[PDB]
Amino acid sequence: DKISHKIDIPDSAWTIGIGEKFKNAGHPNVKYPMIDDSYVQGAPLGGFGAGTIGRTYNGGFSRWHLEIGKNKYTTVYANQFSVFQKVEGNKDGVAQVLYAGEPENGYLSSWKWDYPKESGMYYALYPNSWYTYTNKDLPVQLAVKQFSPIIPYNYKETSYPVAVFKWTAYNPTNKNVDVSIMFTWQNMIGFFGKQVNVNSGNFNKIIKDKSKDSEIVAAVMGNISNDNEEWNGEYSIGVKKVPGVDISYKAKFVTTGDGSDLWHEFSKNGILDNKDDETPTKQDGIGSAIAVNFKLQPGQTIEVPFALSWDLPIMKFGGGDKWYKMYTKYFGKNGKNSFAILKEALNNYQKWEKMIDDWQKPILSNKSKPDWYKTALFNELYYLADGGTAWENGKVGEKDKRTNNMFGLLECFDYNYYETLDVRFYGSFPLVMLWPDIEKQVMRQFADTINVQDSSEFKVGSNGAMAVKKVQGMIPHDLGSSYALPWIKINAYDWQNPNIWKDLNSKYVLLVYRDYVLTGKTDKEFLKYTWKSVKTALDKLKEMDKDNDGIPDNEGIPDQTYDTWSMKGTSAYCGSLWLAALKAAQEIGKVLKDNEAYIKYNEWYKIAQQNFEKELWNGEYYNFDTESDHKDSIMADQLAGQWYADILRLGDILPKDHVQKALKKIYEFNVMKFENGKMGAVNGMRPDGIVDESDIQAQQVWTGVTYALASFMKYRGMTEEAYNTAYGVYKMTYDKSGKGYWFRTPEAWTKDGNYRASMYMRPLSIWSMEVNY
Ligand SMILES: OC[C@H]1O[C@@H](O)[C@H](O)[C@@H](O)[C@@H]1O
Ligand SMILES: [Ca+2]
User: GO terms for molecular function, please (predicted)?
Assistant: First the structure.
């Protein structure tokens, strides 16, 4: 391996061998059906709201999120980089597809598959990833750096449906070597959203652009129809000419055949036929190829950039709404713009690279933080682009711009709900810290729902009761599902009735105040916008105080985020959240000079604080609640309210000394007595040091709960404890001794390591460990 010295891969990059098998992989621990796409994953490509593409550590384009809100795991074998090499003065060269695998069909059987083991590495530090190719049979060594321009405080390039592939080639040998790198791509118009004749009318064309200071060759893959449907638009692949390099192409090869139409050219001399053919296919799948060929002398290095774009301007949800995607603001809405997106990337990728480095550098260069932590911190951000992310630039048919662009991130794919509020309380930290205009938009979406009333009835899944869908003054659980109508039909969740949950209204308030504090305490307009909704939220929750202790009563059913774990009376969780939310509203009262509100929330806070301490402090920790079976259980999340109060700079809601003791107890029990502290914090533990078995949720580690608990510890000066607590999450996710959840971090696992709900929003909470950014 001499190529690694020629490129700049940080030490904290997640690493795995191309072709490596992994023996210890977790699987779902529920009886019911649940996504398991295996451990062959990698860092995603594509912007926010653009639909994303998951290219795996094996090289295949396999995890498809281009249909917004859906997850389709299937390798499109035609999509690859391939290499040709011939040493000067030998009869024949070698040609090899850079994919550690082979088609399951008999399609493309002429290509050279099964890139060998022990012959390269994959590296990820999102939004960059890299592959190195160090193969006995390839004398010139190659590396590619691939990324999308995902840039904090940038709402433009961050939306783009584009990926750059920057290749570096090095000849360490004493002989001249001819090299070709070829990009192949299937014309994927109809891969989704077409019910029949999925390839019909698809056609490819070649664009040669010789503009100012660049020559670019590209293939544009489209369809002859000018319909404005979810399925229609263009893909493009292409390359920028650099000195010492020639370009060739093939406009059309058949992906539903043996592939020799392309490969017989490539495997001869790494040079394609430059054959155009714009005729449209009917039943056969088609694709295009772009190749570069060059000669490398001993010790010579060369760099050449390829790119991929996809212009699929329309997203469709299951209820029938059709929206334009955010990037159409910058490139247009007609689905004919793939080349423009590509050309932007090819001419500006160096600038985008420097911008990525500029945002990563302050964490990367802090040598007081261990590399493993940097690995998790950056890589968990995969979920922002990958979580079914929807970012609308208008409804189809509207003739003018709206004043706002609505946004939604899925909780996950198995529970297909946008912006789950009990979840985003933990999971939205990267948004507020790095894309705060998106964050504030999401919270304004929630503000607008507060007084929405929907009297229609639904059957509650857990107990078969009938409940009203949406009650005035109660915050919704979510903003809809991709199977229905995101942003229009709310509360898609129906396992419990969220209109009687005791955490949502509080978490809403704390999220509002958080967004103000963490963006510099200057945005009074945001507090003004949200103020009525905050006051309404807290007032409705006060009404759920049955026994007059100043605190909402949990009703003996699961009426909060732990949605099968019953709480009754005053709970540590909902009670601390309530306290913190009252103190937050007092502050907002002060900022907005609203004396009535300030005085009311102060008086409610005083009563409630006093009673909380009395009812639940036991000398070592705070009890789970006042009235349940196992009410003395140690809950890992018992002081979630004080966690948020530290972040919001609201001070002590509970005595300093009592907090410190409860956290040391949580570490001593929930962490260190659960599999030797190597798997995170288990949610519930009996004071005898044994896992609480009152419910499955008590026996789970929640990844986002645990990272948040580490933030809390860290800010209370329990540094060792914080990082040890977080380490178990990292280990399970990324390490060879874990369970193979890289780029699909789940909600939860049990002591055996098996999971629930891969690709989950909550563990974005890791960014709460970085709160001064
Ligand atoms: O694991 C529990 C989670 O399950 C999801 O189905 C719900 O939407 C969340 O509200 C809940 O916190
Ligand atoms: Ca009460």
Answer: beta-glucosidase activity; glucosylceramidase activity; metal ion binding
